[PDB]
Amino acid sequence: MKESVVWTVNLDSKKSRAEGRRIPRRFAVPNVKLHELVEASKELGLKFRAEEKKYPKSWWEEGGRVVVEKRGTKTKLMIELARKIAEIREQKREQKKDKKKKKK
């Protein structure tokens, strides 16, 4: 029973503070990917949420937005969001197209 707003650029180091970033680079993942934001919540099945506006509709990289449970927390929530999200990006680094499906 807690709600906190999270952004795609908020946990992105590639974007500047004006661009929409407000998280410490020490725990910020560049190129906010749905896989890191959504896959982290999938681990608990309930904690984060991501919804894109109908305006852009379809699938586009124009930017998205996510909402996570917590409420009362600020960057600390973002630090924790990066804690789970950083794993997913970190998981992508461990595996690559060569070792993703068929080995060569």
From Swiss-Prot:
UniProt entry keywords in alphabetical sequence: Cytoplasm, Ribonucleoprotein, RNA-binding, Signal recognition particle
GO biological process, one term: SRP-dependent cotranslational protein targeting to membrane, signal sequence recognition
Highest taxon above the source species: Archaea
A GO-annotated cellular component: signal recognition particle
Signal peptide from the UniProt entry: none
GO molecular function: 7S RNA binding
Any matching Pfam family: SRP19
Localization of this protein: Cytoplasm
Keyword hit for Ribonucleoprotein: yes
HAMAP family in alphabetical order: SRP19
Protein family per UniProt: Belongs to the SRP19 family.
Assembly and interaction partners: Part of the signal recognition particle protein translocation system, which is composed of SRP and FtsY. Archaeal SRP consists of a 7S RNA molecule of 300 nucleotides and two protein subunits: SRP54 and SRP19.
Protein name: Signal recognition particle 19 kDa protein
Organism classification: Archaea, Methanobacteriati, Methanobacteriota, Archaeoglobi, Archaeoglobales
Gene designation: srp19
